[PDB]
Structures are given as C-alpha cells and as structure tokens.
Design a protein around this ligand. Structure first.
Ligand SMILES: Cc1cc2nc3c(=O)[nH]c(=O)nc-3n(C[C@H](O)[C@H](O)[C@H](O)COP(=O)(O)OP(=O)(O)OC[C@H]3O[C@@H](n4cnc5c(N)ncnc54)[C@H](O)[C@@H]3O)c2cc1C
Ligand SMILES: Cc1cc2nc3c(=O)[nH]c(=O)nc-3n(C[C@H](O)[C@H](O)[C@H](O)COP(=O)(O)OP(=O)(O)OC[C@H]3O[C@@H](n4cnc5c(N)ncnc54)[C@H](O)[C@@H]3O)c2cc1C
Lengths: 488, 488
C-alpha cells in the first residue's frame, strides 16, 4: 500500500516517512533505488560507495527484524522509472520519502512527485535531516540570512523547539514480497574490494553503530569539546559525520540529548562542559547552514560556487596533485593528514582546513581537483557540507577565510597539534624531530635535523613549494585576477 | 505574567506547564502551595512530607540556575485563595499547572479553574503524569475498561505513540520578587526531624537523582528484569517509585527510552533483554491503570474502596497491629520487610504484598488500619497506586488475588528469596538458620534451631498467629459475611 523510499536516511528511529507509513494502517514496502547516473558529477565516490554497501545490508536486517520481507533494492539510471515500476510491480497506493536539500535532489525529486502523481500515486515528503526547514528560518524582512552567525542565532531563538525524535514502528507489515525481486547492487570494483575492506579497521557503518558513537561521545569527550575541539592529536570530536551524512542518526535526537546533558551539567556547576554543548550544537548548526545555503542561494550559472575565483590563474600541475594525494608535500601537518585521509576515509575538520588551504594557497591548484579527490576518499562526503567547506577555505563566503593570506604552518601546528603528536603518529619518520621544528622541518639547522635522523630530500621530502614563493605567486595571481576583474 | 503552580510535577524536563509558560515569552513565577487540609483523609504521610521538603529545595535550586528568582511558597487551607493571592501580589496574568487525577484533585482543580476564571485569570492545565489521558483509551464500543490486560494491550496498540518528552526551558525570567514573599513551610515536627533525616541513607530526593536512578536501571538490572523482577534479595527493580510519584521523572521519557532500548536489544539477538522491557513497561502501565481506575471508577460512598468486605468481622486488636508494625510477628519474610519499610521508607512490590496479605489474611485486622500505616511510612505513598495495590491483595476486583486462601510462607520465600539472603540481611538474628527453614522456623527441629543459636520466644519471636488457626478463622469470617451478604 505504501512505499518507503530510502536515500540518505538509513535509520529506523525518527524517520518520519517510515513511521507514518507504518501508522497509516496498511502495508509498508521499504525500498532503496541506486540511481547514481542521476547525480552527474556528484556521483558517489569510491569509499562512500563502500559505506552504503554495508549500511544497506545493516539496515536490511534492522528492517527484517521489525516484520519485513526485505529492503527492495532497485537499479536504474532514472529514479522515477525504477520507483514507478516498483509502485506497479509491488502495486502500491502511496510513495513516502524524506526530502533532501542538495541542488540535484531538489529538482529531481519534484520531477518524481509529478511523474508519480500522473500515474495516480499519492506522494508525501517529510523532514529527516534538519532541526528546522530552510524556509522556516528567516530574518526580520522575511529574507534568507547570508552569514552563519545571524542564521544560527535565529534557530537558537526559534519560537518552537526542534521536533522530538519519533519512535520507530512497533513493527512494519510488508505483505508477501516473495514475488517482488531485488536487484543485486554493485558498489565496488572487484579490483578495489580488498583495499576497501580495510576501511573497517576504523569504521563500522550502520544505524546501530551511529547510536553507539553518539552515547560514546556524549559520555566521553563532549565535556571537553569547548577546549579540545580544535586538536587533532586526540579523539576530541564525535566521529559522527559519516553516520550523519547517510542519516543513520537523528540530528533531532542529538540536539535533544545534548540539551539534556547541558541542563544537568549546568545544575552541577560544570560551566566548561555547559559551554561544550553550546559549541557542539553550533557544529550541528553548521550542518544546518550547509543545507540552508544550498536551498536559498544555490549554485547558478549567473554566479557559480567559487565565483570570486573566476579569473584566478590556477597552477595546473598534475605532478603537484600527485604529491599532495600521497602526502609527500614536505609539510608535515599536511602530509600527516593526507596519509590519514587515505588510510581511514576521515579527517578532523581542522586538518581538512589545513590540507585544503594548502591545496589552494601554496600549490594553488584548481580547487575543483581537490574537491573531486575529497569526494572519492571521504566516508562522509556530503554535497552541501563539502561545498560549504571549500567555500569557507577559499573565501567565497563573507563569513569565510581571508583570500590574500597564507597560514604559517606553526600557527596551524600550535592550534591543532601543539605537541606534534598528530604528525608523529602518521609520519613515524619524524618521531625524533623536536616539537619546535616538527611542523616546518626546512627551517631546522642541519645539526638538529641530523640529531633527528632526518635528511630533507631522502628520509622525508623537501618543501615542494616554499612559503615565500607561494606568497609571492599568490599576490601575482590575485593582482592578475583583480586587473582582469575590473576589465569586465 | 505567568505563574507555574507545582504540585506533583517536581521537575523541569517535560514539564508542559513550565515549558508552555517559558515559551510564551513573558515572565514565569514558579510557586508551590501547601494546602494539605484540602486532602482530608489523604493528608500527606510522615515520610512523604519529608521527601517533598527535600524535593522542593532541590527544585528551587534548579529553577534559580535557570534564571528564576526563587520558588515561591504559600501556606493556606484553600489552594485557590493562595493562588489568587499570589497573582495579586505579583500582578500575574496566567496560572499554568499540570492536572492530576486522584478524586481529591480532580474536584479541587476543577473548582480552581472556575474560581480563578471568575476573577479574570487565564488558566490552562496540561498532562504530565500519564502516557495517555484516561479518556483516550476505551473499548471498541467507547466505554472504560474494567480489567488491566485489555486496557494495557489497547494502550500498546493505541494509534499514536505517547508524546515524546519536552525540552526544559533554556532560561526562565520572573522579574522582581523582593516584595513577592514566601512563608516557610513546615513539613516535619521538630521531635521527628532527626529520625526523618536517616531516610537519606537510602534516598536522595530530587529530579536530578531521579534522572540518575533511571540511567542506572537502564544500563543495569533492566536487562535481567524478566527473570528477576520478583526477587527481593537484590536490587532487581528500578527504585524509581518515589521519584515517579512526585513527577520528578517523566514517565513519557521512561517509555521512549525503554522502547528504544527494546529496539537495540532485539537487533542484538538479546531476546531475554527484549522480553524484559515488555514486562517493565507493563509495570509502568499499572501506574497508568492506577489513574484510569480513579478517573473512571472513583470510590466514595456506594462502592467505596474495599466495599465488598463492608461485612467483614475484623479483629480489632491494637496489640497485634503493634507487633506487625515492629516486625515482631515471628514470620521472617514478614518481619524482614517490616523492618526495611520502617528503615528506608520503601519496599519491593512482592514484599509489599507479603506483609499486606499477612496483615489481612493471617492477623485479619482492619485493612483500613494497615493502609494508614503504609500512608505514613512509604515515600512513594500514592493515592491511586496504593488503592490499586490493596484492591489487588484483598481480591476486591476481578484481576485480584484469591480470597479464601493464604500463601504458604515457603511459596513466598521460594519466589521472592530463594536463598533466604533477604531476611538474613534484615534479621541478622536468623543468619545461621539454614535456608530450608529460614522462612518457617517454627517447623524446625529444636536441634536445628539451637545449632543456629535460635530459641523461639527469646531470641526470635514465636509465630504470633498460626497458619492453621488463621485459615480456619478465615472460613469462619468469610461465610459469616457471605451469610451477612445474602441477608440484605
Ligand atoms: C574543505 C572542507 C571539506 C569538508 N567536507 C565535509 C564533508 O564532505 N562532509 C561533512 O560531513 N563535513 C565536511 N566538512 C565539515 C567538517 O570538516 C566535518 O563536519 C567534521 O570534520 C566531521 O567530524 P566530526 O563528525 O567529528 O565533527 P564534530 O566536531 O563531532 O561535529 C559533529 C557533527 O557536526 C557536523 N559538522 C561539524 N562541523 C561542520 C561543518 N563545518 N560543516 C558542516 N557540518 C559540520 C557534522 O555532521 C559532524 O559530524 C568539511 C570541511 C572543510 C573545511
Ligand atoms: C499493597 C501495595 C501498596 C502499594 N503502594 C504503592 C504506593 O503507595 N506507591 C507506588 O508508587 N506503588 C505502590 N505499589 C506498587 C508497587 O508495589 C510499587 O510501585 C513498586 O514496588 C515500587 O518499586 P519500583 O519503583 O522499583 O518498581 P518497578 O519494578 O521499577 O516498576 C516501575 C514503576 O512502575 C510503577 N509500578 C510498578 N508496579 C506497580 C503496581 N503494581 N502498581 C502501581 N504502579 C506500579 C511504579 O511507579 C514503579 O516505580 C503498591 C503495591 C501494593 C501491592
């Protein structure tokens, strides 16, 4: 009677589509269709595909234990085609899904509403990803916000709270789907299966593991988040991002659970933990703002993503891109993160800032290139969140980070790795190199680098581009961009 | 502006009156009116009066951290006269509270609404005690239930889940309270304050401690509630009893958290633990049924509580009552539990029936007598739930226990205390008595009693009333009454 279409909500708690299909009375057919060709350039990358293959298997058993035959797995190049074969094949009255906010889904999914409503299907879409809908939060003239601070300040002062997380169905009734077939989905090249499976050393995809990681963070490093959130040398953050990208966890549960921890800590005098919750919710609000930006000010053609860097003369150099991917740049904080991104599919947010800032400030390679690599290597590769991050580090946002400027690697090192233990964990070659030079080995005297057993150029690479050359080329590239910009 | 009248909702999370008042955007003056005169024969007990005063200081402290000036306290024989007087002193506009369901408050609250409306006061009441309101769960012809099982299975198949718990106010503001005065309430007589304080050996009243107790049960004995809920030789139940009576913990939060614990365990193959939450929610539902029976079938005069034994020949013997009070009855399980009741103001459910079944079926004293003792010595002294519990053991309603019948103590012991460790702990005199006789020492050979250093009559009392002489008396008292029954 009702189809529940899964997309990026691979959970069973607080899933309004599935919870309303079950409470309608009739049967519920839960299904997922793999239509990546519809995603154009944003076709899910290598390691994100490896997550879905485990997340779906994991969500299958969850569904089956609640009284389902299966999760129907359909394959297509058009989602409507596969979806309305299923409404026919499995003969339903309704199609329920929770609506997304990326520019691809926003118009593909309104082509589905009409396509399906022309063959008599009733369609309803629900909120599964945001505390507040993007249209629900505006300024005093009713307009979208343009910076993050006024926007998040509004959500924190909204006249109602984010809806409480719904319970899962008591059980779901699917009927006999012994008839209905499921297409064996292919997510992994045979050639890559053996290295993709090593991602499980660090991660376990699934609604169940997302829930255990949240109560692990809530009862652990959340109390110190106020003071440690920027450090990459301890597990200072929640490690929930891939779980949240695929919707395996409610953000409305996280909001509600964290607000309860705050009330208790406030009654215990734990003032530093109370601010920890304030700051961690802000990080949850940055995910809200990523959707708010892609909905209210989408990529257009009149003005694209990185539109302020149109006439920026990028260095085109595949050699440099190869050194960056391999973490052989010779900048230890960058190399350390590029090694961990390849090995685990994840990076602390500030190491993301470092590796991406280095990409467009020192090597000054097309940001597209690095945006694509991120898409193939991140387990939490998220359309709106990746766009917001690259927009932030390149200075397309007014909120964003300054354009005409390069970070001193010691500034990065002292903030995200003060004792150098992040570099030493991922680059053991430099273990015996003192903290004083571990983030800029090129500046150390030969005696100090010989004591550390480091030969810059054989044991560990030389700086592929020197800072002073990078800054000189950055001013020459921006002046080139600014004389060009006025010429229009 | 708004005045939040606290009664039996001593908590900040999922307090709809408080949440609604805070969300109005005005000012929120919290207050407690002490009017025990309005409860007549249900004047709050001795140890319940101690818990309240502990809980109020706890709640006042947490209110002030939220920004309130204080918790306003008023002493008057009539609630309304005090509630009116308060909003006169404050210039308030509204009076919010959460409605109760005992036959006293249902009528006193209702008159307050009309009385306060007349004087120009906006008044609204909210549900905070129950999963569903009683007038929502009816049979298929729309009439109230009369047995527990059909009621609870309708609550469990109800078309909508019980409302998820509300968030506490992020802040409350009340303005200037320096003229708004509060008169210190007196809950304890000076000569009993010391003896009362020792209740803190076993209980710390307060919503925070209710929260911590719930977290402790969920991560602890809840998994083993299916096989151990009857045992009293260990901490097998939640011990959330007095917290839930004073509304220190939202039952709706308990429901949602347990239901979600059920889902994770089911998915983990932990069937026993899954089964355990089923029974634990049933115990929550018994508290729902407690308000159902008092809302639908209240008792005053034509069928007052225990009307069926109107015609019972009660043994009016104040000597036997005192021996029951002091746990000197010679029945260990009875004496053990009677000590703990006086010691810690709490008793396990099954021990609540052992000392109660014994009070009316062995000593056969007025059930109204042992009712007033429970009222004075139970911290979780609850009008509706005490009503249900007595009706259960006396057989006053079809769900109840069989009347002409007396539990063999070894039956009780084997279900509630397999190794006799419960009474060894509360009656260390019997510590050396082997388990076989520990629940019936009078049937032991003198050689065994002396080997344990027991001498019935001097070391540990002789059974004040024998069982044979009591079921005999039971027949002679029941047919004398059925003879009186069919004679009118
Ligand atoms: C260049 C760049 C690329 C990024 N790409 C991604 C991406 O593909 N996917 C992604 O989820 N995040 C991305 N981010 C944001 C941020 O780096 C990650 O959210 C964070 O590192 C995930 O780790 P965590 O779960 O421990 O975060 P926590 O600190 O534990 O935060 C909790 C949750 O808040 C959300 N969140 C936190 N920071 C941000 C942020 N800046 N923007 C949006 N949501 C946020 C995430 O859902 C995260 O799981 C990117 C940032 C930059 C600068
Ligand atoms: C004679 C008699 C008198 C009672 N008097 C009271 C009383 O004054 N106050 C009171 O709250 N309960 C009363 N009960 C019910 C029961 O004994 C207690 O609720 C329970 O033993 C308290 O332990 P717990 O909180 O660990 O229960 P749990 O096993 O943890 O149960 C969870 C909660 O469900 C509720 N509950 C469980 N069983 C019952 C029940 N049979 N009836 C009503 N609610 C129930 C309680 O709120 C309890 O805290 C009485 C029972 C009897 C037989």
């Amino acid at each position: 009677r009702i189809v529940v279409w899964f997309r990026r909500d691979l959970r069973v708690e607080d899933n309004p589509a599935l919870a309303a299909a079950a409470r309608a009375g009739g049967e519920v057919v839960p299904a997922y269709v793999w239509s990546p060709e519809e995603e154009g350039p944003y076709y899910p990358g290598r390691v994100s595909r490896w997550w879905i293959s485990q997340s779906l298997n994991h969500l299958d058993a969850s569904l089956r234990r609640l009284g389902a035959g299966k999760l129907v797995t359909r394959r297509s190049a058009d989602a409507a085609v596969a979806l309305l074969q299923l409404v026919r094949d499995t003969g339903a009255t309704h199609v329920y899904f929770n609506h997304l906010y990326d520019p691809i889904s926003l118009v593909r999914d309104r082509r589905l509403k009409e396509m399906l409503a022309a063959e008599g299907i009733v369609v309803q879409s629900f909120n599964s990803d945001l505390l507040y809908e993007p249209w629900e939060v505006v300024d005093d003239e009713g307009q979208p916000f343009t910076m993050f601070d006024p926007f998040w300040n509004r959500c924190l002062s909204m006249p109602y709270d984010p809806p409480a997380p719904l319970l899962p169905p008591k059980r779901i009734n699917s009927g006999d789907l012994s008839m209905c077939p499921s297409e064996d989905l292919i997510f992994e090249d045979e050639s890559e299966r053996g290295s993709n499976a090593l991602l499980a050393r660090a991660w376990t995809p699934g609604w169940q593991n997302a829930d255990k990681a949240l109560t692990a963070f809530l009862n652990g490093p959340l109390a110190d988040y106020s003071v440690n959130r920027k450090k990459a040398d301890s597990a200072s953050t929640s490690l929930l991002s891939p779980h949240l990208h695929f919707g395996e966890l409610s953000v409305r549960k996280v909001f509600h659970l964290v607000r309860m921890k705050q009330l208790v800590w406030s009654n215990e005098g734990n003032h530093a933990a109370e601010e920890s919750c304030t700051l961690f919710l802000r990080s949850i609000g940055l995910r809200e703002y990523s959707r708010y930006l892609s909905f209210n000010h989408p990529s257009s053609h009149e003005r694209p993503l990185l539109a302020h860097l149109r006439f920026f003369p990028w260095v085109v150099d595949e050699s440099y891109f190869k050194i960056w991917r391999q973490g052989r740049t010779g900048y230890p904080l960058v190399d350390a993160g590029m090694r961990e991104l390849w090995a685990t599919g994840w990076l602390h947010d500030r190491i993301r800032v470092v590796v991406a800032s280095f990409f467009v400030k020192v090597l000054q390679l097309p940001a597209r290139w690095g945006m694509k690599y991120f898409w193939d290597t991140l387990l939490d590769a998220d359309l709106e969140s990746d766009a917001l991050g690259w927009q932030y580090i390149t200075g397309s946002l007014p909120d964003g980070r300054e354009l005409d400027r390069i970070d001193n690697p010691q500034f990065e090192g002292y903030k995200f790795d003060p004792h150098g233990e992040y570099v030493r964990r991922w680059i053991p070659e430099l273990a015996r190199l003192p903290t004083e030079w571990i983030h800029h080995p090129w500046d150390a005297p030969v005696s100090v680098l010989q004591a550390a057993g480091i030969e810059l150029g054989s044991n560990y690479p030389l700086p592929i581009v020197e800072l002073d050359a990078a800054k000189g080329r950055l001013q020459a590239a921006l002046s080139e961009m600014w004389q060009l910009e006025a010429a229009s």
